[PDB]
């Protein structure tokens, strides 16, 4: 599912 951040929604 990753180490990402931002962009949901």
């Amino acid at each position, epitope marked *: 599912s*990753g180490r990402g*951040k*931002g*962009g949901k*929604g």
Partner: antibody
Amino acid sequence: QIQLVQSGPELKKPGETVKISCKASGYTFTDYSMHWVKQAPGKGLKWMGWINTATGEPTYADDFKGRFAFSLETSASTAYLQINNLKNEDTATYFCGRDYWGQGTTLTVSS
Amino acid sequence: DIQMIQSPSSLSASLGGKVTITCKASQDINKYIAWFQHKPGKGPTLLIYYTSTLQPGIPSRFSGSGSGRHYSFSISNLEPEDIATYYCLQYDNLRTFGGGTKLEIKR
């Protein structure tokens, strides 16, 4: 609407175990990692680690290696935080999330 | 393994004004910093990620800039609902929150 709903407030004695739930809706649970964050009374946010919601593999910050366990129930889109052998100093509000966040679960550990 | 020094720890500013918060990382974090708003009784709200990108639904009066070890975050046109504690978060190598900035509106 993206929503994370955490279980209600907890009152425990030192040495007991607690398991807090974080139920996701409005987005695909297994497409985003779930992070856990601690806020002790009067203190700032402290990152505890994350769980990969596609594999179940947890990663813990150093201060949360040992008594802390992240787990999943993928079929219920629910992430869990279990704390074993509770300590007074685990008294805090715990948040799950990544971009969006649960409302917090307040834990009080007292004898 | 990355320390984040957030400044100032608290501030007051007038309605309609603009404030800037800074965070200094102990090593280059490659623009992987985010900024959060946090109000008592609620979960944190993500405002800015990858240094300057706005979360969907967040007004453009929130902004961020930076590179290397030095990052900044601004709120312009301050309004009463901006009362909160703001945090930076590096996510280049594990995650680390800054110590927070408590914002007071000077009415």
